[PDB]
Amino acid sequence: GGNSFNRITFDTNIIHELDGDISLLPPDSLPLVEKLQTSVDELLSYSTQKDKIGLDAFSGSYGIYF
Amino acid sequence: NLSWYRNRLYVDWLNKTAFKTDEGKGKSEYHYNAAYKNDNNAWNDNISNMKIGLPWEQSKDIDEIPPIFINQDNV
Amino acid sequence: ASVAPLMLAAALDTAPNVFGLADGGSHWGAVPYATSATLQISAGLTES
Amino acid sequence: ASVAPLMLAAALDTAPNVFGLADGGSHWGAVPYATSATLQISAGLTES
Amino acid sequence: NTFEQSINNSRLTEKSVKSALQSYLISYEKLAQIDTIKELYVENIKTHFFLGKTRESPCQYYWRSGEQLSNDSHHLRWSEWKKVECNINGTEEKFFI
């Protein structure tokens, strides 16, 4: 006829994870700010890259930044 | 008041101005604000001119008043 | 650092200003003015 | 010397303007506009 | 690009690169708080699109995209959070978006 239509879908909320084991969330940025206030050597170290940032979390949604 | 939160320095303040918005009510909404010093000594702005009614009705001194302090409001 | 205060000022200007039997006072084009001013600041920054 | 009059003008603009059964007139984003203008003056000063 | 042209001195010190590193983490900490609201899966171009609000009382929405099938592998080809520019960012209240 010469038109299209959508659906409004009122009142949506926070999406935590995508469908099928994909998380949209980053790891916690608070310990990186804790370690900014100390030296750079206590931040750019392997012990801070182990527990605070994952292996699979090093890739993924926020992976370009890491 | 100053407050040290998320390894930052928050500072929070209200503003004594009436703002009858429901136009039957009195002392209906007051503007509340926040900010935080970053580690470049630069001030960002969390909340910035959000309208909140007073917890206490009318008295200069009350007993106890904590704010929820993550984006919400109670005593 | 002079980019976020312009967008915050244009956010605050869209709130209504006059009360008490005169609704309104909200500047309608404030967010596009801050978009233009922010983009001018970005152009001057890149030329610097 | 053109830094303190901008912050004083933005202090004075947040006072209410219209009286007599029309509350308000206070420019809400005036202090962030003066922050942006002050920081532009500081950038031009440092490049000078 | 902000980091790369902040350490662009001539006789560098470690203070300048640490200051640019601090500015990088301060800029990252804002993007690490973006709150994903609205999704959209385009089927022709095999992409997701997200709409993300930040945690301020002014809204300041953003957008990003994952650029392939969600289960082609573990990885989507993601994108930087970029700001939606016009007319959403006023301090108003929305029925829908």
Side-chain angles (χ1 to χ4, degrees):
Chain A
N3 54 1
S4 67
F5 291 97
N6 288 318
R7 292 183 65 88
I8 295 300
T9 68
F10 294 98
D11 294 328
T12 184
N13 53 1
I14 296 169
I15 301 169
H16 294 284
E17 292 181 353
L18 196 148
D19 195 3
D21 197 0
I22 292 172
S23 66
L24 298 176
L25 295 176
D28 291 330
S29 67
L30 287 173
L32 295 176
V33 179
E34 292 182 354
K35 294 179 180 292
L36 184 149
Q37 293 174 353
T38 62
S39 66
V40 180
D41 198 4
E42 292 185 354
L43 183 144
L44 297 175
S45 67
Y46 187 78
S47 66
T48 70
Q49 296 177 0
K50 283 182 96 289
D51 293 331
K52 298 176 182 294
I53 294 159
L55 290 170
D56 294 332
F58 202 86
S59 67
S61 62
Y62 288 90
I64 304 170
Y65 299 102
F66 293 115
Chain B
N1 51 356
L2 300 176
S3 63
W4 186 71
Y5 181 67
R6 293 176 66 88
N7 296 309
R8 295 171 177 176
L9 189 144
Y10 286 1
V11 55
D12 301 329
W13 63 95
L14 283 176
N15 288 316
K16 297 195 289 293
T17 311
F19 290 100
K20 294 181 183 291
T21 62
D22 202 4
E23 72 187 3
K25 284 177 91 287
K27 300 183 290 295
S28 66
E29 285 90 6
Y30 287 84
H31 294 295
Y32 178 74
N33 289 315
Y36 60 97
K37 170 256 182 71
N38 282 318
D39 288 327
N40 292 320
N41 295 322
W43 289 90
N44 205 1
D45 193 354
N46 278 317
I47 292 171
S48 180
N49 201 358
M50 182 176 70
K51 292 181 181 179
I52 296 170
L54 287 177
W56 65 95
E57 293 181 354
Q58 195 279 126
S59 65
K60 293 181 181 179
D61 293 331
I62 60 171
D63 292 331
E64 294 174 353
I65 180 68
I68 294 178
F69 186 62
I70 305 165
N71 294 320
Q72 291 181 356
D73 300 321
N74 271 322
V75 173
Chain C
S2 66
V3 168
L6 284 179
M7 295 305 294
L8 192 139
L12 296 180
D13 285 332
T14 61
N17 194 2
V18 184
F19 297 94
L21 293 173
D23 193 3
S26 64
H27 296 89
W28 292 111
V31 181
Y33 287 130
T35 302
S36 296
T38 297
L39 199 57
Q40 289 177 357
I41 291 171
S42 179
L45 184 147
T46 308
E47 290 179 353
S48 297
Chain D
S2 66
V3 168
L6 284 179
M7 295 305 294
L8 192 139
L12 296 180
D13 285 332
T14 61
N17 195 2
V18 183
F19 297 94
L21 292 173
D23 193 3
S26 64
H27 296 89
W28 292 111
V31 181
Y33 287 130
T35 302
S36 296
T38 297
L39 199 57
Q40 289 177 357
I41 291 171
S42 179
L45 184 146
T46 308
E47 290 179 353
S48 297
Chain E
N1 293 318
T2 303
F3 179 80
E4 182 178 0
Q5 290 167 351
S6 298
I7 62 168
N8 200 357
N9 292 314
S10 290
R11 189 175 182 180
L12 280 168
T13 61
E14 194 174 2
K15 291 182 180 179
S16 180
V17 64
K18 286 181 182 179
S19 296
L21 190 67
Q22 290 177 357
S23 178
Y24 183 78
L25 278 175
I26 288 168
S27 297
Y28 172 70
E29 192 181 3
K30 294 178 182 179
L31 296 176
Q33 294 177 355
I34 307 299
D35 198 1
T36 299
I37 294 175
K38 183 71 177 177
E39 81 278 20
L40 182 65
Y41 179 70
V42 179
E43 291 88 5
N44 291 318
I45 305 166
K46 309 297 289 296
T47 57
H48 293 281
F49 289 106
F50 298 101
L51 187 68
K53 190 177 179 180
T54 192
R55 293 179 182 176
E56 295 179 355
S57 179
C59 294
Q60 295 289 110
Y61 297 97
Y62 288 91
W63 66 272
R64 72 186 300 171
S65 68
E67 295 290 328
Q68 63 180 358
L69 285 168
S70 67
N71 291 318
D72 197 1
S73 67
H74 183 74
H75 300 88
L76 284 173
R77 181 178 176 178
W78 291 96
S79 178
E80 182 177 2
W81 288 103
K82 290 183 180 180
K83 184 176 178 179
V84 183
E85 292 175 352
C86 60
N87 293 110
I88 49 166
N89 298 320
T91 57
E92 292 175 352
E93 292 85 5
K94 298 177 178 66
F95 286 106
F96 63 95
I97 176 164

mmCIF file of all heavy atoms in Angstrom, chain A residues 7-49:
data_model
loop_
_atom_site.group_PDB
_atom_site.id
_atom_site.type_symbol
_atom_site.label_atom_id
_atom_site.label_comp_id
_atom_site.label_asym_id
_atom_site.label_seq_id
_atom_site.Cartn_x
_atom_site.Cartn_y
_atom_site.Cartn_z
ATOM 1 N N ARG A 7 6.845 -1.941 16.028
ATOM 2 C CA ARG A 7 6.231 -2.153 17.328
ATOM 3 C C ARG A 7 7.019 -1.369 18.361
ATOM 4 O O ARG A 7 8.253 -1.369 18.340
ATOM 5 C CB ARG A 7 6.172 -3.632 17.707
ATOM 6 C CG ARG A 7 5.224 -4.444 16.848
ATOM 7 C CD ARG A 7 5.161 -5.880 17.317
ATOM 8 N NE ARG A 7 4.581 -5.973 18.654
ATOM 9 C CZ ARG A 7 3.279 -6.083 18.896
ATOM 10 N NH1 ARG A 7 2.416 -6.122 17.891
ATOM 11 N NH2 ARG A 7 2.840 -6.161 20.143
ATOM 12 N N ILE A 8 6.298 -0.697 19.258
ATOM 13 C CA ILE A 8 6.919 0.296 20.128
ATOM 14 C C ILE A 8 7.754 -0.374 21.212
ATOM 15 O O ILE A 8 8.911 0.006 21.437
ATOM 16 C CB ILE A 8 5.846 1.223 20.720
ATOM 17 C CG1 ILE A 8 5.188 2.034 19.606
ATOM 18 C CG2 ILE A 8 6.438 2.134 21.752
ATOM 19 C CD1 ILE A 8 6.139 2.908 18.840
ATOM 20 N N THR A 9 7.187 -1.390 21.877
ATOM 21 C CA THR A 9 7.810 -2.164 22.962
ATOM 22 C C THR A 9 8.243 -1.245 24.111
ATOM 23 O O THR A 9 9.427 -0.993 24.336
ATOM 24 C CB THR A 9 8.984 -3.027 22.472
ATOM 25 O OG1 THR A 9 10.076 -2.190 22.066
ATOM 26 C CG2 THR A 9 8.557 -3.891 21.294
ATOM 27 N N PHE A 10 7.227 -0.705 24.788
ATOM 28 C CA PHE A 10 7.417 0.214 25.903
ATOM 29 C C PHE A 10 8.218 -0.418 27.037
ATOM 30 O O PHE A 10 8.218 -1.638 27.229
ATOM 31 C CB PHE A 10 6.076 0.642 26.492
ATOM 32 C CG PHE A 10 5.235 1.453 25.574
ATOM 33 C CD1 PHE A 10 4.231 0.853 24.839
ATOM 34 C CD2 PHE A 10 5.429 2.817 25.458
ATOM 35 C CE1 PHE A 10 3.444 1.594 23.998
ATOM 36 C CE2 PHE A 10 4.641 3.562 24.615
ATOM 37 C CZ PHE A 10 3.645 2.950 23.883
ATOM 38 N N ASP A 11 8.906 0.453 27.784
ATOM 39 C CA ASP A 11 9.381 0.189 29.146
ATOM 40 C C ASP A 11 10.372 -0.972 29.209
ATOM 41 O O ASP A 11 10.253 -1.878 30.037
ATOM 42 C CB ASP A 11 8.198 -0.048 30.089
ATOM 43 C CG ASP A 11 7.345 1.193 30.273
ATOM 44 O OD1 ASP A 11 7.898 2.312 30.215
ATOM 45 O OD2 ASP A 11 6.117 1.050 30.456
ATOM 46 N N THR A 12 11.354 -0.951 28.315
ATOM 47 C CA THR A 12 12.396 -1.958 28.385
ATOM 48 C C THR A 12 13.420 -1.579 29.453
ATOM 49 O O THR A 12 13.404 -0.479 30.010
ATOM 50 C CB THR A 12 13.063 -2.142 27.022
ATOM 51 O OG1 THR A 12 14.024 -3.204 27.096
ATOM 52 C CG2 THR A 12 13.744 -0.860 26.581
ATOM 53 N N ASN A 13 14.326 -2.511 29.736
ATOM 54 C CA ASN A 13 15.218 -2.392 30.879
ATOM 55 C C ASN A 13 16.637 -2.760 30.458
ATOM 56 O O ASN A 13 16.957 -2.844 29.268
ATOM 57 C CB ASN A 13 14.704 -3.250 32.046
ATOM 58 C CG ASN A 13 14.457 -4.699 31.656
ATOM 59 O OD1 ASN A 13 14.684 -5.106 30.516
ATOM 60 N ND2 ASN A 13 13.995 -5.491 32.615
ATOM 61 N N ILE A 14 17.485 -2.978 31.463
ATOM 62 C CA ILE A 14 18.903 -3.240 31.255
ATOM 63 C C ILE A 14 19.095 -4.621 30.645
ATOM 64 O O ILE A 14 18.582 -5.621 31.162
ATOM 65 C CB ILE A 14 19.652 -3.127 32.590
ATOM 66 C CG1 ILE A 14 19.576 -1.702 33.135
ATOM 67 C CG2 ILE A 14 21.086 -3.618 32.463
ATOM 68 C CD1 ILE A 14 20.060 -1.589 34.569
ATOM 69 N N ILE A 15 19.841 -4.684 29.549
ATOM 70 C CA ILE A 15 20.245 -5.955 28.965
ATOM 71 C C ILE A 15 21.615 -6.310 29.521
ATOM 72 O O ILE A 15 22.600 -5.612 29.258
ATOM 73 C CB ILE A 15 20.284 -5.884 27.435
ATOM 74 C CG1 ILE A 15 18.920 -5.502 26.879
ATOM 75 C CG2 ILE A 15 20.703 -7.222 26.863
ATOM 76 C CD1 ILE A 15 18.970 -5.172 25.414
ATOM 77 N N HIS A 16 21.685 -7.396 30.287
ATOM 78 C CA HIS A 16 22.955 -7.793 30.883
ATOM 79 C C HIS A 16 23.775 -8.642 29.921
ATOM 80 O O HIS A 16 24.964 -8.387 29.712
ATOM 81 C CB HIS A 16 22.708 -8.542 32.191
ATOM 82 C CG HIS A 16 22.104 -7.690 33.261
ATOM 83 N ND1 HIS A 16 22.835 -6.765 33.975
ATOM 84 C CD2 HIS A 16 20.838 -7.614 33.731
ATOM 85 C CE1 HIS A 16 22.045 -6.160 34.843
ATOM 86 N NE2 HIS A 16 20.827 -6.657 34.716
ATOM 87 N N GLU A 17 23.159 -9.662 29.335
ATOM 88 C CA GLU A 17 23.856 -10.562 28.434
ATOM 89 C C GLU A 17 23.072 -10.730 27.144
ATOM 90 O O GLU A 17 21.839 -10.719 27.139
ATOM 91 C CB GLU A 17 24.089 -11.935 29.074
ATOM 92 C CG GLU A 17 25.075 -11.922 30.229
ATOM 93 C CD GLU A 17 25.306 -13.297 30.816
ATOM 94 O OE1 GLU A 17 24.597 -14.243 30.412
ATOM 95 O OE2 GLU A 17 26.201 -13.432 31.675
ATOM 96 N N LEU A 18 23.806 -10.888 26.048
ATOM 97 C CA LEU A 18 23.203 -11.219 24.769
ATOM 98 C C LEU A 18 22.743 -12.678 24.789
ATOM 99 O O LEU A 18 23.117 -13.462 25.666
ATOM 100 C CB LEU A 18 24.208 -10.952 23.643
ATOM 101 C CG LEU A 18 23.870 -10.846 22.152
ATOM 102 C CD1 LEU A 18 24.816 -9.861 21.526
ATOM 103 C CD2 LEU A 18 24.020 -12.162 21.429
ATOM 104 N N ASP A 19 21.899 -13.031 23.824
ATOM 105 C CA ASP A 19 21.354 -14.379 23.731
ATOM 106 C C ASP A 19 22.453 -15.373 23.363
ATOM 107 O O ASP A 19 23.126 -15.218 22.341
ATOM 108 C CB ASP A 19 20.237 -14.409 22.691
ATOM 109 C CG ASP A 19 19.381 -15.657 22.780
ATOM 110 O OD1 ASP A 19 19.600 -16.483 23.691
ATOM 111 O OD2 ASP A 19 18.487 -15.816 21.925
ATOM 112 N N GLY A 20 22.628 -16.397 24.197
ATOM 113 C CA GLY A 20 23.556 -17.472 23.898
ATOM 114 C C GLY A 20 24.987 -17.248 24.347
ATOM 115 O O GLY A 20 25.908 -17.324 23.526
ATOM 116 N N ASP A 21 25.163 -16.964 25.645
ATOM 117 C CA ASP A 21 26.467 -16.883 26.323
ATOM 118 C C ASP A 21 27.365 -15.808 25.705
ATOM 119 O O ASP A 21 28.507 -16.059 25.314
ATOM 120 C CB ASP A 21 27.167 -18.251 26.345
ATOM 121 C CG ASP A 21 28.298 -18.328 27.373
ATOM 122 O OD1 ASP A 21 28.552 -17.333 28.086
ATOM 123 O OD2 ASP A 21 28.939 -19.396 27.467
ATOM 124 N N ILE A 22 26.832 -14.594 25.607
ATOM 125 C CA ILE A 22 27.621 -13.417 25.264
ATOM 126 C C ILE A 22 27.285 -12.334 26.277
ATOM 127 O O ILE A 22 26.132 -11.899 26.366
ATOM 128 C CB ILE A 22 27.361 -12.924 23.830
ATOM 129 C CG1 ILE A 22 27.887 -13.927 22.806
ATOM 130 C CG2 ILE A 22 28.011 -11.573 23.608
ATOM 131 C CD1 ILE A 22 27.498 -13.604 21.390
ATOM 132 N N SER A 23 28.283 -11.913 27.046
ATOM 133 C CA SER A 23 28.086 -10.905 28.075
ATOM 134 C C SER A 23 28.402 -9.527 27.512
ATOM 135 O O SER A 23 29.443 -9.332 26.878
ATOM 136 C CB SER A 23 28.969 -11.194 29.286
ATOM 137 O OG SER A 23 30.337 -11.065 28.950
ATOM 138 N N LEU A 24 27.505 -8.579 27.747
ATOM 139 C CA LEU A 24 27.705 -7.201 27.331
ATOM 140 C C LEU A 24 28.447 -6.381 28.374
ATOM 141 O O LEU A 24 28.767 -5.217 28.114
ATOM 142 C CB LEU A 24 26.357 -6.544 27.038
ATOM 143 C CG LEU A 24 25.538 -7.169 25.915
ATOM 144 C CD1 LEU A 24 24.202 -6.484 25.805
ATOM 145 C CD2 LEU A 24 26.283 -7.063 24.623
ATOM 146 N N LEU A 25 28.722 -6.954 29.538
ATOM 147 C CA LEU A 25 29.311 -6.262 30.674
ATOM 148 C C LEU A 25 30.834 -6.288 30.590
ATOM 149 O O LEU A 25 31.409 -7.253 30.082
ATOM 150 C CB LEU A 25 28.869 -6.907 31.981
ATOM 151 C CG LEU A 25 27.384 -6.810 32.312
ATOM 152 C CD1 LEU A 25 27.078 -7.572 33.591
ATOM 153 C CD2 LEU A 25 26.965 -5.356 32.427
ATOM 154 N N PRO A 26 31.499 -5.245 31.076
ATOM 155 C CA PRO A 26 32.952 -5.277 31.185
ATOM 156 C C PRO A 26 33.367 -5.913 32.497
ATOM 157 O O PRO A 26 32.523 -6.125 33.380
ATOM 158 C CB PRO A 26 33.331 -3.791 31.152
ATOM 159 C CG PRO A 26 32.178 -3.132 31.797
ATOM 160 C CD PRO A 26 30.958 -3.913 31.396
ATOM 161 N N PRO A 27 34.645 -6.230 32.674
ATOM 162 C CA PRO A 27 35.148 -6.458 34.029
ATOM 163 C C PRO A 27 35.217 -5.148 34.797
ATOM 164 O O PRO A 27 35.129 -4.056 34.229
ATOM 165 C CB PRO A 27 36.538 -7.060 33.803
ATOM 166 C CG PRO A 27 36.922 -6.620 32.456
ATOM 167 C CD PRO A 27 35.660 -6.547 31.657
ATOM 168 N N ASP A 28 35.369 -5.274 36.115
ATOM 169 C CA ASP A 28 35.241 -4.131 37.011
ATOM 170 C C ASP A 28 36.394 -3.154 36.831
ATOM 171 O O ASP A 28 37.566 -3.536 36.899
ATOM 172 C CB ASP A 28 35.180 -4.609 38.458
ATOM 173 C CG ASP A 28 33.894 -5.337 38.771
ATOM 174 O OD1 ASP A 28 32.863 -5.014 38.145
ATOM 175 O OD2 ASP A 28 33.913 -6.234 39.636
ATOM 176 N N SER A 29 36.056 -1.890 36.599
ATOM 177 C CA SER A 29 37.037 -0.847 36.342
ATOM 178 C C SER A 29 37.549 -0.190 37.615
ATOM 179 O O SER A 29 38.443 0.656 37.537
ATOM 180 C CB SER A 29 36.440 0.221 35.423
ATOM 181 O OG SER A 29 35.396 0.923 36.075
ATOM 182 N N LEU A 30 36.999 -0.550 38.772
ATOM 183 C CA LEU A 30 37.486 -0.002 40.039
ATOM 184 C C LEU A 30 38.919 -0.397 40.407
ATOM 185 O O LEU A 30 39.655 0.487 40.878
ATOM 186 C CB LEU A 30 36.503 -0.350 41.163
ATOM 187 C CG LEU A 30 35.190 0.424 41.130
ATOM 188 C CD1 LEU A 30 34.219 -0.099 42.172
ATOM 189 C CD2 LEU A 30 35.494 1.889 41.368
ATOM 190 N N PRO A 31 39.388 -1.655 40.260
ATOM 191 C CA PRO A 31 40.796 -1.919 40.615
ATOM 192 C C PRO A 31 41.806 -1.281 39.677
ATOM 193 O O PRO A 31 42.931 -1.001 40.111
ATOM 194 C CB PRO A 31 40.894 -3.446 40.577
ATOM 195 C CG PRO A 31 39.531 -3.917 40.763
ATOM 196 C CD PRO A 31 38.693 -2.941 40.032
ATOM 197 N N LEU A 32 41.439 -1.018 38.421
ATOM 198 C CA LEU A 32 42.330 -0.275 37.537
ATOM 199 C C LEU A 32 42.509 1.161 38.019
ATOM 200 O O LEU A 32 43.598 1.732 37.906
ATOM 201 C CB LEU A 32 41.792 -0.305 36.110
ATOM 202 C CG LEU A 32 41.766 -1.688 35.463
ATOM 203 C CD1 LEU A 32 41.126 -1.633 34.090
ATOM 204 C CD2 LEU A 32 43.170 -2.247 35.378
ATOM 205 N N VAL A 33 41.460 1.745 38.594
ATOM 206 C CA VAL A 33 41.574 3.075 39.176
ATOM 207 C C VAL A 33 42.307 3.017 40.515
ATOM 208 O O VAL A 33 43.009 3.968 40.882
ATOM 209 C CB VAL A 33 40.166 3.690 39.281
ATOM 210 C CG1 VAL A 33 40.179 5.081 39.899
ATOM 211 C CG2 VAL A 33 39.564 3.754 37.907
ATOM 212 N N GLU A 34 42.180 1.899 41.244
ATOM 213 C CA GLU A 34 42.991 1.686 42.444
ATOM 214 C C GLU A 34 44.474 1.670 42.111
ATOM 215 O O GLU A 34 45.298 2.200 42.864
ATOM 216 C CB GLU A 34 42.622 0.367 43.124
ATOM 217 C CG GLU A 34 41.253 0.304 43.745
ATOM 218 C CD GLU A 34 40.989 -1.019 44.437
ATOM 219 O OE1 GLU A 34 41.836 -1.931 44.326
ATOM 220 O OE2 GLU A 34 39.936 -1.147 45.096
ATOM 221 N N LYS A 35 44.828 1.072 40.980
ATOM 222 C CA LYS A 35 46.222 0.911 40.606
ATOM 223 C C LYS A 35 46.759 2.042 39.739
ATOM 224 O O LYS A 35 47.971 2.097 39.511
ATOM 225 C CB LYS A 35 46.393 -0.431 39.910
ATOM 226 C CG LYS A 35 46.126 -1.550 40.875
ATOM 227 C CD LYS A 35 46.259 -2.893 40.245
ATOM 228 C CE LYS A 35 45.986 -3.962 41.276
ATOM 229 N NZ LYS A 35 47.049 -3.988 42.314
ATOM 230 N N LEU A 36 45.895 2.929 39.238
ATOM 231 C CA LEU A 36 46.377 4.183 38.668
ATOM 232 C C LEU A 36 47.063 5.033 39.728
ATOM 233 O O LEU A 36 48.039 5.732 39.440
ATOM 234 C CB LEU A 36 45.213 4.957 38.035
ATOM 235 C CG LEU A 36 45.420 6.274 37.262
ATOM 236 C CD1 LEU A 36 44.379 6.394 36.176
ATOM 237 C CD2 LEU A 36 45.324 7.517 38.145
ATOM 238 N N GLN A 37 46.545 5.003 40.955
ATOM 239 C CA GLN A 37 47.046 5.856 42.023
ATOM 240 C C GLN A 37 48.346 5.343 42.617
ATOM 241 O O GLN A 37 49.046 6.099 43.299
ATOM 242 C CB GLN A 37 45.977 5.987 43.103
ATOM 243 C CG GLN A 37 44.757 6.743 42.619
ATOM 244 C CD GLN A 37 43.639 6.748 43.630
ATOM 245 O OE1 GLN A 37 43.718 6.083 44.659
ATOM 246 N NE2 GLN A 37 42.587 7.504 43.344
ATOM 247 N N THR A 38 48.679 4.085 42.376
ATOM 248 C CA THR A 38 50.011 3.565 42.631
ATOM 249 C C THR A 38 50.836 3.744 41.357
ATOM 250 O O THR A 38 50.455 4.499 40.460
ATOM 251 C CB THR A 38 49.930 2.112 43.098
ATOM 252 O OG1 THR A 38 49.339 1.313 42.068
ATOM 253 C CG2 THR A 38 49.090 2.008 44.358
ATOM 254 N N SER A 39 51.987 3.084 41.271
ATOM 255 C CA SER A 39 52.828 3.211 40.093
ATOM 256 C C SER A 39 52.199 2.520 38.884
ATOM 257 O O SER A 39 51.227 1.769 38.991
ATOM 258 C CB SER A 39 54.213 2.621 40.357
ATOM 259 O OG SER A 39 54.139 1.218 40.545
ATOM 260 N N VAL A 40 52.775 2.799 37.714
ATOM 261 C CA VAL A 40 52.347 2.144 36.485
ATOM 262 C C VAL A 40 52.765 0.678 36.498
ATOM 263 O O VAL A 40 52.061 -0.185 35.959
ATOM 264 C CB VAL A 40 52.923 2.913 35.280
ATOM 265 C CG1 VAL A 40 52.531 2.284 33.958
ATOM 266 C CG2 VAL A 40 52.467 4.355 35.325
ATOM 267 N N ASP A 41 53.888 0.370 37.156
ATOM 268 C CA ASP A 41 54.406 -0.992 37.201
ATOM 269 C C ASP A 41 53.491 -1.915 37.998
ATOM 270 O O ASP A 41 53.429 -3.118 37.722
ATOM 271 C CB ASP A 41 55.812 -0.983 37.804
ATOM 272 C CG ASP A 41 56.604 -2.250 37.500
ATOM 273 O OD1 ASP A 41 56.110 -3.125 36.760
ATOM 274 O OD2 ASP A 41 57.736 -2.371 38.015
ATOM 275 N N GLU A 42 52.758 -1.376 38.968
ATOM 276 C CA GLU A 42 51.773 -2.174 39.683
ATOM 277 C C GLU A 42 50.443 -2.263 38.953
ATOM 278 O O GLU A 42 49.523 -2.915 39.453
ATOM 279 C CB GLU A 42 51.551 -1.618 41.091
ATOM 280 C CG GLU A 42 52.754 -1.787 42.003
ATOM 281 C CD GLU A 42 52.486 -1.337 43.424
ATOM 282 O OE1 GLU A 42 51.393 -0.792 43.684
ATOM 283 O OE2 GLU A 42 53.370 -1.532 44.285
ATOM 284 N N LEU A 43 50.321 -1.631 37.788
ATOM 285 C CA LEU A 43 49.123 -1.721 36.966
ATOM 286 C C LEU A 43 49.355 -2.577 35.726
ATOM 287 O O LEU A 43 48.594 -3.510 35.462
ATOM 288 C CB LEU A 43 48.657 -0.307 36.593
ATOM 289 C CG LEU A 43 47.378 -0.091 35.793
ATOM 290 C CD1 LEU A 43 46.682 1.155 36.279
ATOM 291 C CD2 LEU A 43 47.743 0.110 34.357
ATOM 292 N N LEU A 44 50.393 -2.266 34.949
ATOM 293 C CA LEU A 44 50.718 -3.022 33.740
ATOM 294 C C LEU A 44 51.590 -4.219 34.116
ATOM 295 O O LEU A 44 52.762 -4.325 33.752
ATOM 296 C CB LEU A 44 51.419 -2.135 32.721
ATOM 297 C CG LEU A 44 50.671 -0.940 32.134
ATOM 298 C CD1 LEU A 44 51.590 -0.133 31.247
ATOM 299 C CD2 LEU A 44 49.468 -1.386 31.352
ATOM 300 N N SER A 45 50.995 -5.134 34.874
ATOM 301 C CA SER A 45 51.678 -6.341 35.304
ATOM 302 C C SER A 45 50.765 -7.536 35.085
ATOM 303 O O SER A 45 49.555 -7.394 34.905
ATOM 304 C CB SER A 45 52.111 -6.257 36.771
ATOM 305 O OG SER A 45 50.996 -6.239 37.636
ATOM 306 N N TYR A 46 51.370 -8.722 35.104
ATOM 307 C CA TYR A 46 50.638 -9.947 34.800
ATOM 308 C C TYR A 46 49.685 -10.327 35.926
ATOM 309 O O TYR A 46 48.629 -10.919 35.670
ATOM 310 C CB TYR A 46 51.635 -11.072 34.541
ATOM 311 C CG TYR A 46 51.035 -12.362 34.056
ATOM 312 C CD1 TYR A 46 50.650 -12.511 32.734
ATOM 313 C CD2 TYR A 46 50.862 -13.436 34.917
ATOM 314 C CE1 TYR A 46 50.112 -13.696 32.280
ATOM 315 C CE2 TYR A 46 50.334 -14.627 34.469
ATOM 316 C CZ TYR A 46 49.951 -14.747 33.154
ATOM 317 O OH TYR A 46 49.411 -15.931 32.710
ATOM 318 N N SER A 47 50.031 -9.977 37.167
ATOM 319 C CA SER A 47 49.186 -10.310 38.307
ATOM 320 C C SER A 47 47.889 -9.512 38.295
ATOM 321 O O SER A 47 46.881 -9.949 38.859
ATOM 322 C CB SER A 47 49.948 -10.069 39.607
ATOM 323 O OG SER A 47 50.216 -8.689 39.787
ATOM 324 N N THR A 48 47.895 -8.337 37.664
ATOM 325 C CA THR A 48 46.661 -7.580 37.512
ATOM 326 C C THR A 48 45.899 -8.004 36.269
ATOM 327 O O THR A 48 44.699 -7.741 36.161
ATOM 328 C CB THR A 48 46.962 -6.090 37.443
ATOM 329 O OG1 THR A 48 47.622 -5.798 36.209
ATOM 330 C CG2 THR A 48 47.883 -5.719 38.572
ATOM 331 N N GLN A 49 46.584 -8.641 35.322
ATOM 332 C CA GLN A 49 45.923 -9.181 34.148
ATOM 333 C C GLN A 49 45.393 -10.587 34.374
ATOM 334 O O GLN A 49 44.727 -11.119 33.485
ATOM 335 C CB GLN A 49 46.881 -9.192 32.959
ATOM 336 C CG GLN A 49 47.339 -7.830 32.485
ATOM 337 C CD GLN A 49 48.337 -7.931 31.349
ATOM 338 O OE1 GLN A 49 48.683 -9.025 30.917
ATOM 339 N NE2 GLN A 49 48.825 -6.798 30.884
#
